[PDB]
Design a protein around this ligand. Structure first.
Ligand SMILES: CCCCCCCCCCCCCCCCCCCCCCC(=O)O
Length: 133
């Protein structure tokens, strides 16, 4: 179900990430470093448990979850959120909730590339990842 998402992915295009970070209240200095960072995202599976690592020269994160089961998460920008990840239309949809706010992180495969769409408020960011061998 999730199997074409699995592997190591490198950031190759970003659009509107500053908009997205600013909407979340990320400070200018962090937005500045993040705008020049190219993370590696690693998505692994062990049975029903997915682990999603995001590695960079600035911030690292790691989450583990079962699809369709809520989990606590502390994001790269230090939000403490209630999260759930599911497959929807073949897309991996990650919803974060905190303080009555929501953001979605939607991953879809298009021509072998991993497109991550990040929405908060009115801000919509599109970031493109290519697989590493
Ligand atoms: C989960 C990403 C964090 C690990 C590497 C981060 C590189 C820059 C963006 C994300 C975190 C650091 C800067 C603060 C903004 C974080 C906003 C939420 C997470 C965005 C993840 C973006 C991505 O996975 O490409």
């Amino acid at each position: 179900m999730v199997d074409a998402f699995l592997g190591t992915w490198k950031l190759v295009d970003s659009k509107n990430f500053d908009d997205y970070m600013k909407s979340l209240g990320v400070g200018f200095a962090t937005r500045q470093v993040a705008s020049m960072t190219k993370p590696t995202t690693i998505i692994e599976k062990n049975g029903d448990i997915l682990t999603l690592k995001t590695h960079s020269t600035f911030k690292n994160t790691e989450i583990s979850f079962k699809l369709g089961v809520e989990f606590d998460e502390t994001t790269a920008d230090d939000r403490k959120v209630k999260s759930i990840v599911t497959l929807d239309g073949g897309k991996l949809v990650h919803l974060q909730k905190w303080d009555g706010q929501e953001t979605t992180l939607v991953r879809e495969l298009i021509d072998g590339k991993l497109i991550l769409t990040l929405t908060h408020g009115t801000a919509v960011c599109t970031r493109t990842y290519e697989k590493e061998a």
